[PDB]
Each structure stands twice: as structure tokens, then as C-alpha cells.
Design a protein around this nucleic acid. Structure first.
Ligand code: MG
Ligand code: MG
Ligand code: MG
Ligand code: MG
Ligand code: MG
Ligand code: MG
Ligand code: MG
Ligand code: MG
Ligand code: MG
Ligand code: MG
Ligand code: MG
Ligand code: MG
Ligand code: MG
Ligand code: MG
Ligand code: MG
Ligand code: MG
Ligand code: MG
Ligand code: MG
Ligand code: MG
Ligand code: MG
Ligand code: MG
Ligand code: MG
Ligand code: MG
Ligand code: MG
Ligand code: MG
Ligand code: ZN
Ligand code: ZN
Lengths: 91, 114
RNA sequence: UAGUGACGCGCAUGAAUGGAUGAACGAGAUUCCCACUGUCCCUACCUACUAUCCAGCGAAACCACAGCCAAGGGAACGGGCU
RNA sequence: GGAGAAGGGUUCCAUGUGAACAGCAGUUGAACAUGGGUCAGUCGGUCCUGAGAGAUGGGCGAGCGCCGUUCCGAAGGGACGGGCGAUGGCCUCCGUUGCCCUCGGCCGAUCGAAAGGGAGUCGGGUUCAGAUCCCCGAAUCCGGAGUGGCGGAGAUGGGCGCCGCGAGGCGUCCAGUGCGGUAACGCGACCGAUCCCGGAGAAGCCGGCGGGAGCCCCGGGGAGAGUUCUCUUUUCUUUGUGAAGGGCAGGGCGCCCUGGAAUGGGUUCGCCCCGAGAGAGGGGCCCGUGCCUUGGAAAGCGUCGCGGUUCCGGCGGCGUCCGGUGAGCUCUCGCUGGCCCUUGAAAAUCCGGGGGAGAGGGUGUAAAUCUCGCGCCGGGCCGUACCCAUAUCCGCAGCAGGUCUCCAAGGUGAACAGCCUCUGGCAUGUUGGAACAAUGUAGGUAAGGGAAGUCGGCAAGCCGGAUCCGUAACUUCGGGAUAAGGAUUGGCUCUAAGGGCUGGGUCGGUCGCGGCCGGCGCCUAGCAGCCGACUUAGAACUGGUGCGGACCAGGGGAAUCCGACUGUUUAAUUAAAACAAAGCAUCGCGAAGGCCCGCGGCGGGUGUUGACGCGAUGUGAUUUCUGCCCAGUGCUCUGAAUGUCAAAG
RNA sequence: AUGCCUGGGCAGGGCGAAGCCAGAGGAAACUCUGGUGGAGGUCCGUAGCGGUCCUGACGUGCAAAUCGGUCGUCCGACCUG
């Protein structure tokens, strides 16, 4: 609450588009423009390049992830279920 | 202050119509048309963002005139792949082949056991 | 007889044929106030270009015939008739 | 003002006439009549492909033809290596052609950009009109090069047995498709096919910073010059070097070697980086459009003086010099970031790499040189004048309309705003003279009142820049906001604050003011010298209260209705509440499918698509809510329990 | 008029979103102050694009739709060959 009270990133939109829409898009913007930690090099340089495309500055590795977040909950659940099914099948 | 004009019939400031200022022995400023800036070859590995060293950055058709020495470097995969990538390739090939030999020996031992 | 605020008795209001509200915005439609001023009381004066006259150059629209009025009668409002 | 693209097509240049035209005139013209003028391997077409167009095969169609561009195709006529046969040329040696074996993906013929991609030329001079095209002088690209024209690289190593004092010579065995550096990589070269891999070509918009150049600015030297009634070491103009090579500054590196860091460090305007190796040292690579040099002072320019009646592209003396600055403008190069439910071209063409199918001569030679340095020959065809716009184009015309770009000085000023000026350009826009009547068109000023005028403050006026204070209701908390409301602004003379570069290693010894050696002072509270850009604040004095003195340049407040907003709309009467818009809610479709085109086809679009998609509707930001009714008209579901129900049987 | 391909262009200022730095308070959660930063289908405004009002000029006009002032927008659903 240094410069703005309760808008933060959506301060660029001004008074337009409605309060609820700006509040809804605030979390999406924060997740989209956040830099994540790459689980290949250990550095916090994972940045979103395009929709579902995440790139590491150091590793130079591109990872196919979510649209606005590096990992979606559905993808993690599917990965866990696939690992469980593989362990049940191959044994 | 002297003002100058294009010396060709192309009046539009396109990519092919780039000029620079030059002073002639006649003490007048004229337009000299410049060649496009060349780029050094990129490594064949595709992971290194930098461009390869030891090769002149000229237009692709200029390489026909350029000698062989300026177009590559005195290494394996010289002028197409970086030294770091080549070293990684050497180590990876040796380690993978050694692991294959170990796996083959283990499989032969398993065959002999049964 | 304008505007705003309340009432509902609503010829013929009304809920995505959307109702109510609503910050910012609008060469959108209205009311009042401050300042301002020739909009006005009540008009005047000044400047430039025209209009004016001259040298030269020079059309178009229109044209039954033409062109002073009162009354009368008449196709019930005439330049013509008395 | 100087040059282009489309368009025009002789309008361009010289001479002559004034019949007609240029709404007056004309000795003038873009009029008329004679002639003249456009010079290319390097500038573009030509080459490539893009969106797309369009043959063959195939299908349809009564038919001219149409569908479609890989789909219902025996779709490459090419190449290397080997063999045979034939001719030609000193049938030695090679070329050509024919046959046989062998090898072989492409992806649709073809067209499609004078602004996309695309190797390679500049300087001076020169015409009445053309010159990166002509001449002079310097280069460069591509192709050919057989008999290779030359040199150079593959190159002239060792061992052994002899001879000779030695240098060296002879015979034999071989090696010899290069060399250097730990490394990045470098050296003028430095075999190689079918095949495979990669790169370049080949990429969006915006912000910030840094380097280079052009221009502008300041302090000077010269040369030519306006003023000089007073002053002014005066003000005005000029004061340089091409492409292509070599060398060196200057930038960048996500390149390498030593080493391992918390007391975390390095560092930018911002960022950012570091045990996956940061600071500190030593190297390497790329761009070098900048500086020096060949080019090149011979030429160009400014001056002073001449040869020659004239023609005459001449002859000569001089100079073309030394420095500093700037969030300054433009171009370019390079780093660094921000935005996308937007990710921002293809092909021609060129190059590097992985492999070793094969070749070479055998110990002085050869096969090879993605040719190392020179040397020889050629580069065909088309366009090239001029205007490019208040007169060479389109509007019936020399029409206040329309029509795509590049170059961009000084002052004031935030500014590419407005105003004045320099280089350059012109005559005021199809005529001039004489007066200043009324009505006009375009500007203004008006005592007192201040909207009493009018449907309506229509029109005009008021405020206006910058600095210092201050700023309400409401609100989606972002705004409102320059809210509203106040004070200052000139000129002159000062004060204070905001920075860089260099300098001490001084003493003694030694060597030739400089270099080396040792301990000293280590300025570690820093000072001395020299430079340079603009700013901010404060103070005094002063003018008839004048000072954003011209120009530039918001009138505000309280409310109602509508549309969330940004955006779009009836070219030529309606810019709005209309349309659109994100949000919200329904409908259909799992591919022989939904929606749609099509006379036609195994046709086509969505679809290079797959329910977070495509297609069809309604409403229209945020908040709240979305009441009841299936009687009617629609839509939809199943149903041999079925009344009516055509053809055929 | 719309879609696609390939090119070109858009002065000078205001407001000040993320992110970052320093100081202060706190037991923590964290909160204030001063800076840096330059985002926005942001604002004033030129070029460009368009055409609200004067229902001005003109209305056998410069013009079979032009002209003057005043205007909307001017980094994006932008303008244009
Ligand atoms: Mg081109
Ligand atoms: Mg009233
Ligand atoms: Mg009703
Ligand atoms: Mg209704
Ligand atoms: Mg009559
Ligand atoms: Mg001109
Ligand atoms: Mg002429
Ligand atoms: Mg005449
Ligand atoms: Mg073509
Ligand atoms: Mg380092
Ligand atoms: Mg020409
Ligand atoms: Mg004229
Ligand atoms: Mg005049
Ligand atoms: Mg005149
Ligand atoms: Mg008065
Ligand atoms: Mg008004
Ligand atoms: Mg207000
Ligand atoms: Mg109300
Ligand atoms: Mg609207
Ligand atoms: Mg209209
Ligand atoms: Mg209108
Ligand atoms: Mg509905
Ligand atoms: Mg029903
Ligand atoms: Mg009118
Ligand atoms: Mg009239
Ligand atoms: Zn990583
Ligand atoms: Zn690499």
C-alpha cells in the first residue's frame, strides 16, 4: 500500500472496465508476469513467453505449461493419476 | 546547410534504400548506399543463444568470395557448432557408449546365469 | 405551460422484449448561478476587399405582347375589357 | 527550396512568328513553325517467392467450357561410377553422342512485387538541353580458362651402406592429403563423391542508455569583404578527400586460462549476475561507416597576377590551419528491458560441418587445390529527357478540390507550435487606374446597465503559459483535478549551490629532464593547477503598477435524462440516445457431424479446425435483482397403445 | 465496402501502474516517509485522419459539396501506397 491502496497491478487500467473485472484480472496478471523458479537449474528465471509457453533464461529450456500459471492443478492431478496407473499396470 | 537527395529512383525509405553521409574531395556531402549488416552463424546445438566466433559476419552470398579459413575454425564441427557443445557431445557419446557396454555385460551375465 | 424535489390515482411503467442504480467520460438533450461581454437599451466610428467611375475583355437565367392606378363585371383577386 | 514513384508523352533545349489560344496586354509562353536531345556488368526490369492466379492427370457439362492444384496419375529424359559401340581432332590424349548396368523423393507446368529477398562503382571534369551511363583516374562482381600463363602450398625428412677434412655427392628402406597455441582460436593455401545435419537469407511494436558520423555552438589563425559621422583586435562567407586495401583507436561478447567467495560481493538511469564459478589478473573473437596511410594533390575550392583582338576547358604564387563543448537535431550501430487469449513471411541463392565411396606418385615427381598472389577473355536485351503540382497528373480548364515519398539552418521559445531571418524561390495567384456613397464580406473599439435580446448566452467576450500555496461532494479508491480559489512574473548588479582532467612514489645510488633499485610521506580529515555545459534559489537597485507586454495560450460551479467508457456510422442536409464493444445467457454439432456456398462433380468454406472449438441468437461496463404464466403460436422429445395418410407392392 | 500479402509514418508536455532502493515504527503480521521506474485501447496538443457549431462565406461559386474561424481524435478498434 505504498503508492496505491487496493489495485496494484491493475492500476494501469484506470477507472475503466469495472471494479470486479479488474479485481478478477489482477490475479491473472500477477501470475502471468511472475518469474518462477526453474526446476532444472535452481534459478528464479522461469518466464512466460507465450500462451502455455514458459522459458528459462539460464537453462534455455522451454516447458509447456498453463496459460497464466506455470503449473495448473488439473495437470498436477493428471500427472499423479498417470503415475499411479503406471505403477498399478507395470508393477 | 546543404541538403541532399537520393541518387536513385527509389524514393521510399525501405530496407534496401539505406544510406549514409560521406564527404567527397569536392567538399560536398553525398549519399552512399550501405550493404546490409551480416550475422555470424548460429550454433547447430540450438541451446546456446550466442553466435559462433571466428567467422566473419557478412551477407550469405559474400561467403562465396571469402576464403575457407575465414568461414570456419580449426576444430571438429568448426564454424557450425560451438566448442562447448562439441565437448559436451564428446563426453556424452563416450559415457553413453560405456553405459551400453556395461548393460551388455550385465545382460550377458544374466544369460550365462540362466 | 420551464427545472428540481415528493404523491400515485400508472389513458398506455416494469424486471436479459431487462428493472433500479451508477465513478469516469461525451463537438449528446435540458434548469439555475458566478464572471464576461454591443444579444439588447441604442446605436456610432475606424480598417481591408467589393459595390461606384474609367481603359481593355465580356456572358447567363428569362422573354404570348408588354408593363401607372381605384371600382365594376368576369374562370367568383386584371397591365389589357367598362 | 532541391529530388523521386504513379500518371503525362515531347510538355525538355535552341532559334524564329505573333494568324488563333494563355477571359487585360504582351516584345512573353507549357501557343505555333523548324531543328536537337535520353549513351550502363555495377541504377532498376530481367531472377525468387508471398496473398493469389492458372494448365496437365481426374471429374462434370447439350455446349462454348467449368470444378480442382495433388486430388480417381507408368508425373524425375537428370547424374555419377563401370562396360560396349562410333566419329572427330598430332584416333598417344580428350571431347561428343548412342546403348547396357547403376544412382535419384519431393510436391507440381507456369505466372505473380521497377517500395519484399537479390553478388558487384566511386571521385573529378564535361552539354543549350544526357550523364553512379560520356571522358579522365582509381576499383569491384560473375562466368570461362582446355592445351594450365607463372609463382607458391601437397615439398623435398630420417635411417642405413659408402666416398670426401668439411660443405657436400651416390645407392637402398620408408614417412610425407600442412602448421601453432592449455584453451577460446590463429596462420596466404592446406584431396575428396553419392548421402545426411545445420546456418545465413529470415523478421512485430514501444521505452531507456551508450558509441560513431553529419549539422548547429564557442575560443582562435589565414583569405576575401559590409560599416567606420562615434564605437567595435569588426561583422559576413570559406577553411576537404571517394570506393576498394593495410594499420590503429572505439564499442560488444550468453568466449577462454589461474582461483574459489558470507563480513556477501560486483554493478545499471533502471536492471541484473554469481559454487551450473562472482570480484582480481592474462588472453581470444566480431563490428570497426571513426583516425593514419596507397589512392592523393597531379585533381577540387578561396584568393592575387597574367598569356591570347578573338578561338582558347591555360599559365602561375599563396592558403586549404589549431582546439573545446552540449538531456542539442538527424542517420546509423550496440546493449537492456516492457506488451500480446496479437508471437510478428516464403522462396531463389550462398556457406559450414559428419562420413570416407575413390585418386595420386613413389623418393622427385604427381592427383588436388569451397584458389593463396598475380596474369588473359567476355558480360547480351529493355527504361534513362522533362513536370511530379495554387500551370506539364485526375476533376470539360493554367479549376482555392484530390494525389505516395526523401533532404530539413539561425533567434525566441517546452517544442517539427506561432513570429522574424540566412541558402534557395517568387511577383501576390485569368487585368490596371481614380475616389472612399449606401448595402455587404472579414476584423475591431464603445460611456452607464450586464442577457432586460432570443425558442435557446447563437455569435462575441471572459480564463489561459510557468513558479509558489491551496483544492470539495461523490467514487468502482484508479479518479474527480489544471477542481474551485489566491500571490508572483520586466530590466539591471550581485551572492550561494549543482562538475571533470592532471599533479606527490619528493631521498640516495645508478644509467641515458627521463628510466631502474630500497626504505621512507603513503593526501586514505585531501589539497594545488587547468578547463567546461547549462540551471535553481536568494538579495539589493530601478522604471508613470509595467512586466506569460508581440506570438503561443482551459471560462467555471450546482443538478436532471441517455449512452459505461475508447471506437464506428447515412461520401453530398441527420455524429446521435443510433451501430459496435468486453461482460452476461441460451441453441446445434463427436466428422458419412453442425452452419453455409454451389445447375453440375469422390465439388467447396469454417478446416493448417475438434467442445477452453466452430457455427446461430438475445442483452449490453461495476453493484443488486431477474417475480408469475406453456392458455395461444413456435421449437423439441418418444410412440406399432394409433385416427388420417401418396406412390409402389 | 471488407479480408489477405508486402512497404511507409505518427513534434513537444501532464498524470504517474507494476517492479526496485534507503530511512523510521513493530515482538511479528507488516505499516508509513523520501526517492527510482515509465505502464496506460491515459490526458493537453502539432503533423496526419474526420467534419460539431457559426444552420458563417459561396450558392448561374474556386468547387455537379469548396472556403474561414471554431472543433473530435492524435501509440491504437491508428493513418496510408
Ligand atoms: Mg527491391
Ligand atoms: Mg428561464
Ligand atoms: Mg406492459
Ligand atoms: Mg418495454
Ligand atoms: Mg398578368
Ligand atoms: Mg520542388
Ligand atoms: Mg520551355
Ligand atoms: Mg488575352
Ligand atoms: Mg515471376
Ligand atoms: Mg567475471
Ligand atoms: Mg531524370
Ligand atoms: Mg493560377
Ligand atoms: Mg491582394
Ligand atoms: Mg498581379
Ligand atoms: Mg459597453
Ligand atoms: Mg459560443
Ligand atoms: Mg467538477
Ligand atoms: Mg431521478
Ligand atoms: Mg457513446
Ligand atoms: Mg451527410
Ligand atoms: Mg453534419
Ligand atoms: Mg432472447
Ligand atoms: Mg406451447
Ligand atoms: Mg449556411
Ligand atoms: Mg450572391
Ligand atoms: Zn533453468
Ligand atoms: Zn552451441
Amino acid at each position: 500500500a505504498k503508492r496505491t491502496k487496493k489495485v496494484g497491478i491493475v492500476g494501469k487500467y484506470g477507472t475503466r472496465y469495472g471494479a470486479s473485472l479488474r479485481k478478477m484480472v489482477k490475479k491473472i496478471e500477477i501470475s502471468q508476469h511472475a518469474k518462477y523458479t526453474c526446476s532444472f537449474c535452481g534459478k528464479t528465471k522461469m518466464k512466460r513467453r507465450a500462451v502455455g509457453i514458459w522459458h528459462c533464461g539460464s537453462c534455455m529450456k522451454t516447458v509447456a505449461g498453463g496459460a497464466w500459471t506455470y503449473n495448473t492443478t488439473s495437470a498436477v492431478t493428471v500427472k499423479s493419476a498417470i503415475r499411479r496407473l503406471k505403477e498399478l499396470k507395470d508393477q | 546547410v546543404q541538403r541532399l537527395t537520393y541518387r536513385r529512383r527509389l524514393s521510399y525509405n525501405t530496407a534496401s534504400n539505406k544510406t549514409r553521409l560521406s564527404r567527397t574531395p569536392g567538399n560536398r556531402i553525398v549519399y552512399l548506399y550501405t550493404k546490409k549488416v551480416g550475422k555470424a552463424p548460429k550454433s547447430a546445438c540450438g541451446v546456446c543463444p550466442g553466435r559462433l566466433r571466428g567467422v566473419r559476419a557478412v551477407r550469405p552470398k559474400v561467403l562465396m568470395r571469402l576464403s575457407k579459413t575465414k568461414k570456419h575454425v580449426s576444430r571438429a564441427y568448426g564454424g557450425s557448432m560451438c566448442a562447448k557443445c562439441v565437448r559436451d557431445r564428446i563426453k556424452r557419446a563416450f559415457l553413453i557408449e560405456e553405459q551400453k557396454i556395461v548393460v551388455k555385460v550385465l545382460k550377458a551375465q544374466a544369460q550365462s546365469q540362466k
